């Protein structure tokens, strides 16, 4: 069930059909890698999951990107009359000393996914302190409908985190929660990504059942 990180095959990004999928594609964020790994696929169609990378401090030529591509994930829901799109990225390891595996996320809060004029009302993310929310995001941080984020090491908090940025970032093929295979969805609901005995690394998969809704309520920026 566990396969090499550099061998996990991403899902292709389908042409979106459902209202939920169309909105998730429309508002796909972009990601600039300032520090650490590029994002990787965590799971493939048959449910096999990535083995990630052991933490081994500074290393040249590890996790710069899979030969098979990359991935970004999204799950969406109505929260207090606002449509929340939570995007998540997986990385094979993460600093802050560090750990195998990593997850980061950005929530794009929009008014109405069904509207041709759907609009970003807010953004929240896995920031170094709190969720670094903006309601709405400043224009300098948004490229069209795409929020610009940076994956970085915050050296004051000692955390691997996301922040908004003016700089252009990279896009990844999007697979939405509803369009995952049953097997892949099971693996993401059920895998423990934290190797510590007492779960101290904060490595819950942010889109999974019983984390997803709770995170949306915690991050609520309005």
Quote the CA–CA distance of 127 and 133 in Å, as a whole number.
9
Query: Helix or strand or coil: residue 16?
Result: coil
Q: Minimum distance between the CB of residue 134 and Mg ion, rounded to whole angstroms?
A: 19
Least distance CB 203 / Mg ion (angstroms): 9
Nearest residue to the partner Mg ion, using Cβ:
160
- Candidates 6-14, 66-74, 130-138, 159-167 — which segment interacts with Mg ion by CB under 5 A? 159-167
CA 82 to mean position of chain CA atoms: 20
Contact window for Mg ion (CB under 5 A) among 8-16, 66-74, 129-137, 153-161? 153-161
When the beta carbons of 13 and 160 are compared against Mg ion, the nearer one is 160
Kindly state the smallest distance separating residue 211's Cβ from Mg ion, in Å. Answer: 15
207 Cβ neighbours under 8 A, 6+ residues apart: 73, 74, 75, 86, 88, 105, 177, 188
Pick the stretch among 117-125, 137-145, 154-162, 190-198 that binds Mg ion (CB under 5 A). 154-162
Q: Rounded to an integer, what distance in angstroms lies between the CA atom of residue 63 and that of residue 69?
A: 12
Separation of alpha carbons 65 and 56, rounded Å: 18
- Rounded CA separation 149/30 (Å): 6
Cβ at position 11, least distance to Mg ion in Å? 23
Residues 115-144 touching Mg ion, rule: CB under 5 A, are: none
The yes or no reply on residue 163 touching Mg ion (CB under 5 A) is no
DSSP letter (8 states) at residue 210: T
Q: How far is the CB of 193 from Mg ion (least distance, A)?
A: 12
Question: DSSP characters for 71-140?
Answer: -EEEEEEEETTEEEEEEEEEEEEEE--EEEEEEEEEEEEES-TT-TT--EEEEEE--SSTT--BSSPPGG
Which listed range, 57-65, 113-121, 157-165, 183-191, lies at the site for Mg ion (CB under 5 A)?
157-165
Mapping DSSP to helix (H, G, I), strand (E, B) and coil, where does residue 139 land?
Answer: helix
Query: Which residue among 160, 165, 187, 191 contacts Mg ion (CB under 5 A)?
Result: 160
If the CB atoms of residues 54 and 114 are measured against Mg ion, the closer one turns out to be 54
Q: Of 65 and 96, which CB lies nearer to Mg ion in the complex structure?
A: 96
Residues that bind Mg ion (CB under 5 A): 160
């Amino acid at each position: 069930q566990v396969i090499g990180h550099d061998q996990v095959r991403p899902f292709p990004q389908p042409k979106p059909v459902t209202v939920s999928d169309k909105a998730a594609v429309k508002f796909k964020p972009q990601l600039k890698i300032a520090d650490g790994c590029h994002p990787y696929p965590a799971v493939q169609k048959d449910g096999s999951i990535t083995g990630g990378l052991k933490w081994s401090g500074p290393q040249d030529g590890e996790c710069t990107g899979s030969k098979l591509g990359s991935q970004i994930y999204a799950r969406s829901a109505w929260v207090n009359d606002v449509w929340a799109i939570m995007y998540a990225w997986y990385f094979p390891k993460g600093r802050g000393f560090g750990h195998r595996h990593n997850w980061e996320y950005v929530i794009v809060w929009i008014d109405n996914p069904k509207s041709k004029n759907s609009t970003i009302l807010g953004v929240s993310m896995s920031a170094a302190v709190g969720y670094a929310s903006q309601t709405p995001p400043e224009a300098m941080y948004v490229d069209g409908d795409s929020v610009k984020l940076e994956y970085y090491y915050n050296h004051l908090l000692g955390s691997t985190s996301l922040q908004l940025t003016e700089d252009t970032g990279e896009f990844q093929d999007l697979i939405t929660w509803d369009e995952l295979s049953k097997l892949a969805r099971y693996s993401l609901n059920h895998t423990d990504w934290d190797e510590t005995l007492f779960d101290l690394a904060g490595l819950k998969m942010p889109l999974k059942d019983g984390v997803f809704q709770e995170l949306l309520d915690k991050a609520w920026p309005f």
